Structure 1
Amino acid sequence: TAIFSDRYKGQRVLGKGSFGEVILCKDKITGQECAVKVISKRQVKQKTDKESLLREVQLLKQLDHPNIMKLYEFFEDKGYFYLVGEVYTGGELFDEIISRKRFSEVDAARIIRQVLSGITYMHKNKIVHRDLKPENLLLESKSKDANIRIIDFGLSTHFEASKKMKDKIGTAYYIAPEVLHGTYDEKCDVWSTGVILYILLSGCPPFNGANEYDILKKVEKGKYTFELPQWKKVSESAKDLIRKMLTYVPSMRISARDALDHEWIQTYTKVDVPSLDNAILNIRQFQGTQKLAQAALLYMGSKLTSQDETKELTAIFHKMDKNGDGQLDRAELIEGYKELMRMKGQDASMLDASAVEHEVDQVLDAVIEYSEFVTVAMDRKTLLSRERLERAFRMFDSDNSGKISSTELATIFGVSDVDSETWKSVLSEVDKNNDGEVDFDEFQQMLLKLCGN
């Protein structure tokens, strides 16, 4: 009954999350800022009925814990769901960890106590996460003492997971084996936390592989070891907790509540404690790899979307061109730009007609010839993905060599799920005399060829 766009105005894009885009919105009356997740009904299938989702939303809005994202409102229209809640500005936990100079078991214990405290509270209220991963751990604010906030508790119960690799990066490392076979309960979140803890103390995923399916095979077998040099400096109580959290049979696995009472959490959140330097280095490399694979898939996705929309907007304006002089008025360009989103679905950044008019005004200030309007309007859509790709390449290239080796390409394309023979074939066409490494432009050329260009 209540309309989302009548209450809130979209201010900035916050980024892509599970099931949808996240937008920084502001209440038009009170000035309250909020983070809004927009879920497209045509792209995301519902697992439950309308009344089951309404009942969970009503419960989720009443729950309150300092390590759980606060939900404020919920809206639904013909084609979307709008989940409105509190905005957190500290970024992803792992992006803050790689910025600091030192990281010890005290820092890892304080992180995991917060995550376990939030999970314990949500399990007492019969809510399961299922998709707990570092990307769902946000820091409340930019301060070094900020609490961790878990986002997306309870959503996996009501929305089906995306099958596209651009939406599944990192997910295979943390998923509990019982989730893969279909019988699972709240203990799956203890397993996921166990994996995160293993990565915080060693910087290496316990279940790894050269591609998504190889990771899932290791997860399904459930076997892992503490046979890496970096585990020698870690306490025995930490390894005991990980062992209890990564116990295969969920009825034998420790509960979130009992993981809080574990000796490791009690000792390290209240006796020599060195900095886990090799772990930080490995987390920094792991984070850079995941972000570059993700940036590569989103670059290819936005390039295909841009090609689709460039051609559709050209056809719309060509039909609207009454005399065929290649030119149109501002009012006509709004009509055609609105027509594009009416058929291709509403864009998260274009919440209502007023947002569409402002986007058209920004393009008209740079450039009337409708072909020029199309080019500038579509380059603005890809801007973020192109600069994210170059920035992620530069971050991955930690020695500033300007190049990425074939072994690094194999790792990146493995995480991106691009077949080995497919990317090597593309590399041969970009540079016929390739010498086992590519610069940024050659890498970008490879991605353009990997999406039909």
Structure 2
Amino acid sequence: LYFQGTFAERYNIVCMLGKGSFGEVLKCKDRITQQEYAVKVINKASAKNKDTSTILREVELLKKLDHPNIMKLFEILEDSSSFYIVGELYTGGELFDEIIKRKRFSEHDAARIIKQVFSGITYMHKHNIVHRDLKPENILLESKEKDCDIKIIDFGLSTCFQQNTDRIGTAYYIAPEVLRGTYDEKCDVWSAGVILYILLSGTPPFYGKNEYDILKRVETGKYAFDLPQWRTISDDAKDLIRKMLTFHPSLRITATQCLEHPWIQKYSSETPTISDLPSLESAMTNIRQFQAEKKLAQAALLYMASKLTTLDETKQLTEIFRKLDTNNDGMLDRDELVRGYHEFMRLKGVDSNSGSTIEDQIDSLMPLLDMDGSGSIEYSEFIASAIDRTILLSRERMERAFKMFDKDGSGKISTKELFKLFSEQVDNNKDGEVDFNEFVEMLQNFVRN
């Protein structure tokens, strides 16, 4: 083990992606799976503001954020000079560029975008994380596909790490209380309100040639819907923006109230159709298999689906997820699954009335699906249960899972090493240990008899 690094053994750096406030962002590649990732490299000695143990606990909470509109982080690794924070790679660029290209969005297009910002921010705030610098440059498009999900990036590190030490246009998005040294949940709502005002109008609500004049406007909180293009935008969109850019933060609406505003609901009516039946049929086949398997099987599968799947693999399940997610909060609750299953039947021409109802089924399934006990089925739990087991069983994926657990790098998993993954066994050669070939059988057996 002496000549193996944690980061360098698993990943090869491909090139630089960019550099913002904390550390620096590169593209890296898993040396076994060949899957590509975004890694933020932070220099320990320059940048650390807390002991390592503090930092690992805070970053661990960031890895646990599982929401379709929040950047996905897979791990934090270290060497003697750096922390490496490895995340999912997004290729669609900043929402900012999409503003430049489009200039302005219709009410429908703006609602579909801002609703995801609301969703992601609601979830952050429920997990007691404030963004602090929400703006279009810190939201990425998952890909170049049309209507792909947005991803909120660049948050969560400001107490663990010191900044690098001339961002242009950042003054547009600041709430007035930020000028008084305050950052809190309500500052994110204000920033989201400035984003919306720009999506609808093409123009900042507190505007000016340079940072001085802009900051002057922000500070009074004075803005208008005076630009000609506003005459044609609905009162409902204006009502929402007014609630978000309310001067006094205690009067300003919460992110959940943003998510639930009637203007959002008016443009988020996405719902399963006939064209989704193939996706829905497949998802359901696989979810029954999952319910059937040992808690141990279910456990290993969640781990593998959440660490090793890719965007391309999950995009159709992503779409089904989104259509079942009725209230747009980025997770599936019990009623949503019951309605979803009733809607699947209706679409298929099958009468729900036909030994065990839809509601009993869902009720017995929630505890198995909701593996962290959250009260909801988050993104990754749905993917684990709804994806083709097959897909996860590629040889390279098993090898990477095997290496995640072989802590000592002996070539064989011990009992203690193995619990990690799930947190009796069958050994063919009976050394009391699992070399890879047995581990493949073990995982392959989970899907099988």
**TM interval, short-chain normalised:** 0.5 to 0.7
Residues 97/185 of structure 1: CA separation in 2 closer, same or farther (3 Å cut): closer
Aligned to 1:220: 219
Instruction: Give the partner amino acid of 1:187.
Output: K
Instruction: Give the partner amino acid of 1:21.
Output: E
Residue 37 (structure 2) pairs with residue 34 (structure 1): yes
Matched residues in 2 for 1:244 and 1:10: separation? 45
TM-score of the aligned structures, taking structure 2 as reference length: 0.55
Matched residues in 2 for 1:101 and 1:208: separation? 16
Once the two structures are TM-superposed, the CA of residue 142 in structure 1 deviates from its matched residue by: 1.0
Matched residues in 2 for 1:179 and 1:69: separation? 24
Q: SS where residue 264 of structure 1 aligns?
A: helix
Q: SS where residue 187 of structure 1 aligns?
A: helix
Aligned to 2:332: none
Residue pair 2:5, 2:79 contacting (<8 A) in 1 also: no
Matched residues in 2 for 1:191 and 1:162: separation? 26
Aligned to 1:395: none
Aligned pair partner of 1:122 in 124, 139, 148: 124
Matched residues in 2 for 1:265 and 1:149: separation? 18
Matched residues in 1 for 2:47 and 2:216: separation? 26
Residue 11 (structure 2) pairs with residue 12 (structure 1): no
Deviations 1:237-278 (A, max 9, x none): 1111111111122221100001111121111333xxxxxxxx
TM-score of the aligned structures, taking structure 1 as reference length: 0.55
Aligned to 1:188: 187
Residue pair 1:129, 1:155 contacting (<8 A) in 2 also: no
Aligned to 1:81: 83
Residue pair 2:13, 2:28 contacting (<8 A) in 1 also: yes
Aligned to 2:57: 55
- Percent of aligned positions with the same letter in both sequences? 70
Residue pair 1:36, 1:85 contacting (<8 A) in 2 also: yes
Instruction: Give the partner amino acid of 2:37.
Output: C
Deviations 1:284-338 (A, max 9, x none): xxxxxxxxxxxxxxxxxxxxxxxxxxxxxxxxxxxxxxxxxxxxxxxxxxxxxxx
Instruction: Give the partner amino acid of 2:128.
Output: K
Q: SS where residue 4 of structure 1 aligns?
A: helix
Residues 78/219 of structure 1: CA separation in 2 closer, same or farther (3 Å cut): farther
Residues 5/214 of structure 1: CA separation in 2 closer, same or farther (3 Å cut): farther
Aligned to 1:92: 94
Once the two structures are TM-superposed, the CA of residue 213 in structure 1 deviates from its matched residue by: 3.1
Residue pair 1:131, 1:156 contacting (<8 A) in 2 also: no
Aligned to 1:243: 242
Matched residues in 1 for 2:96 and 2:135: separation? 10
Matched residues in 2 for 1:58 and 1:28: separation? 24
Q: Matches of residues 200-279 of structure 1 in structure 2 within 5 Å?
A: 200-270=199-269
Deviates more, 1:201-210 or 1:109-118: 201-210
Aligned to 2:198: 199
Residue 26 (structure 2) pairs with residue 23 (structure 1): yes
Which consecutive unaligned segments of at least 5 residues does structure 1 have? 271-453
Q: CA RMSD in A?
A: 2.2
Q: SS where residue 128 of structure 2 aligns?
A: coil
Residue 148 (structure 2) pairs with residue 149 (structure 1): no
Residues 5/104 of structure 1: CA separation in 2 closer, same or farther (3 Å cut): same
Residue pair 1:129, 1:156 contacting (<8 A) in 2 also: no
Instruction: Give the partner amino acid of 2:124.
Output: M
Which consecutive unaligned segments of at least 5 residues does structure 2 have? 270-449
Residue pair 2:23, 2:164 contacting (<8 A) in 1 also: no
Q: SS where residue 185 of structure 2 aligns?
A: coil
Deviations 1:404-432 (A, max 9, x none): xxxxxxxxxxxxxxxxxxxxxxxxxxxxx
Deviations 1:125-147 (A, max 9, x none): 11111111101111111100200
Residue pair 2:103, 2:202 contacting (<8 A) in 1 also: no
Residues 218/86 of structure 1: CA separation in 2 closer, same or farther (3 Å cut): same
Query: What count of residue pairs does the alignment treat as equivalent?
Result: 266
Once the two structures are TM-superposed, the CA of residue 212 in structure 1 deviates from its matched residue by: 2.0
Residue pair 1:139, 1:148 contacting (<8 A) in 2 also: yes
Residue pair 2:25, 2:38 contacting (<8 A) in 1 also: yes
Deviates more, 1:136-145 or 1:49-58: 49-58
Q: Matches of residues 39-438 of structure 1 in structure 2 within 5 Å?
A: 39-41=42-44, 44=47, 46=49, 48-99=50-101, 103-161=105-163, 163=165, 165=166, 168-270=167-269
Once the two structures are TM-superposed, the CA of residue 24 in structure 1 deviates from its matched residue by: 0.8
Instruction: Give the partner amino acid of 1:159.
Output: F
Instruction: Give the partner amino acid of 2:111.
Output: A
